[PDB]
């Protein structure tokens, strides 16, 4: 399928243990994508003071269109030194591992995968 059906569970930003997916653009994406597949993918919503808790680069979900069975559809764009890879819609927070971190809530999104 073009599209998945996922709950991504909502960390707070001083819970998450593993901050980002790894150390290029390329890897970063590969990495969200296999987490996303996996079950193992947390979100944490932006806000002020968020982003530079998290490490560089940055994945995001961003809204791709105007929301099947209550699913945002949303793709991905990473992040590095102020340069985005992708074009998108608004963010509804960046992806991080999600390794047994307790959530605050779940973000039902269709990614296009």
């Not at 193992?40 to 530079?52: M, Q, S």
Request: proline share 5%.
């Amino acid at each position: 399928k073009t599209h998945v059906q996922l709950s991504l569970p909502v960390l707070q930003v001083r819970d998450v243990l593993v901050r980002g997916f790894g150390d290029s653009v390329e890897e970063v994406l590969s990495e969200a994508r296999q987490h996303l597949k996996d079950g193992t993918c947390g979100l944490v919503e932006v806000e002020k003071g968020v982003l530079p808790q998290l490490e560089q680069p940055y994945v995001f979900i961003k809204r791709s269109d105007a929301a099947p069975h209550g699913h945002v559809m949303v793709e991905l764009v990473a992040e590095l030194e102020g340069i985005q890879y992708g074009r998108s819609g608004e963010t509804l927070g960046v992806l991080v591992p999600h390794v047994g971190e307790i959530p605050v809530a779940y973000r039902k999104v269709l990614l296009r995968k």
